[PDB]
Amino acid sequence: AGHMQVATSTVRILGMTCQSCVKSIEDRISNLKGIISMKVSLEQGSATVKYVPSVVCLQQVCHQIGDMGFEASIAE
């Protein structure tokens, strides 16, 4: 992973039912072990992600919500 330890990202959340996808991703990501901390901000329309990329990859996080049928995109 490019990041030395903790990678930060703000992932935009786009969907008609934001709460539904937040619920969907929150459960799946919490199912992943090695999680540090994250915050989904409705006001921002994006979530602040802090994880060790080697332990947990951001692609899976995007995968979890994307597979649900909602669009999310990584940004710093």
Side-chain angles (χ1 to χ4, degrees):
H3 291 268
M4 291 189 292
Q5 184 62 33
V6 180
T8 57
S9 182
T10 47
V11 55
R12 68 178 178 87
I13 305 300
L14 180 61
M16 291 177 68
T17 41
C18 184
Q19 291 177 31
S20 297
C21 63
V22 171
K23 179 179 176 61
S24 183
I25 187 174
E26 188 278 327
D27 180 73
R28 298 306 303 184
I29 193 169
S30 60
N31 290 333
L32 300 178
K33 295 178 65 176
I35 54 173
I36 283 74
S37 185
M38 67 179 292
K39 173 178 170 59
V40 179
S41 301
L42 295 176
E43 292 301 306
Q44 293 174 331
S46 62
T48 302
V49 178
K50 301 191 296 179
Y51 295 108
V52 181
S54 58
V55 178
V56 179
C57 60
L58 289 68
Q59 181 61 32
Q60 290 298 327
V61 173
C62 183
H63 179 85
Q64 291 171 331
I65 185 171
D67 278 45
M68 184 61 181
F70 299 99
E71 182 181 72
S73 183
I74 180 174
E76 220 294 273

